Amino acid sequence: TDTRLPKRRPMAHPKKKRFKLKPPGPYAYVQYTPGEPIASNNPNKGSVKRRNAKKRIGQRRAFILSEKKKRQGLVQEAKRKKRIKEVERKMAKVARERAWEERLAELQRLEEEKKK
């Protein structure tokens, strides 16, 4: 029961360009304010400019931010692994000292058994 109409296909016949739609003759009939200088160009609220250029600017800004985030993530992950290695090194120090206590006890007491 939908009453909406389908989008229609564009026609392929040639259309007149706007220069040929103007009447021939020397005069141009431009918009004129009776106390103001005649403007060379009268843009309105639809006169939008540089749409592709702004799209490219936004794309470049997004690329810069994304590459920065990638770089920061890689740096942070490597510093995390470095901190883990520092903690493991500090643990291995005291494990090494205790193991040397055990080994020195074993060697000096083997010599003590040689003494008895």
Partner 1 sequence: SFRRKRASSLDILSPKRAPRDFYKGKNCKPTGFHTKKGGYVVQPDKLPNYVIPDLTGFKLKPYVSQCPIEV
Segment 56-75, which members bind RNA (CB under 7 A)?
A: 59
The nearer residue to RNA, 28 or 94, going by C-beta atoms, is: 28
The closest of 90, 92, 88 to 100, measured between CA atoms, is: 92
Please give the size of the binding site for RNA, defined by CB under 7 A.
33
- Taking CB under 7 A as the criterion, the residue among 23, 26, 34, 37 binding RNA is 23
Does residue 8 bind RNA (CB under 7 A)? Answer: yes
Cα gap 41→35, rounded to integer Å:
17
CA atoms lying within 13 Å on the CB side of residue 9: 3
Q: Which stretch binds RNA (CB under 7 A): 2-10, 63-71, 75-83, 84-92?
A: 2-10
Which of positions 7-36 make contact with partner 1 (CB under 8 A)? 7, 9-10
| Residues near RNA, by CB under 7 A | 7-11, 13-18, 20-24, 29-31, 39, 41-44, 46-53, 59
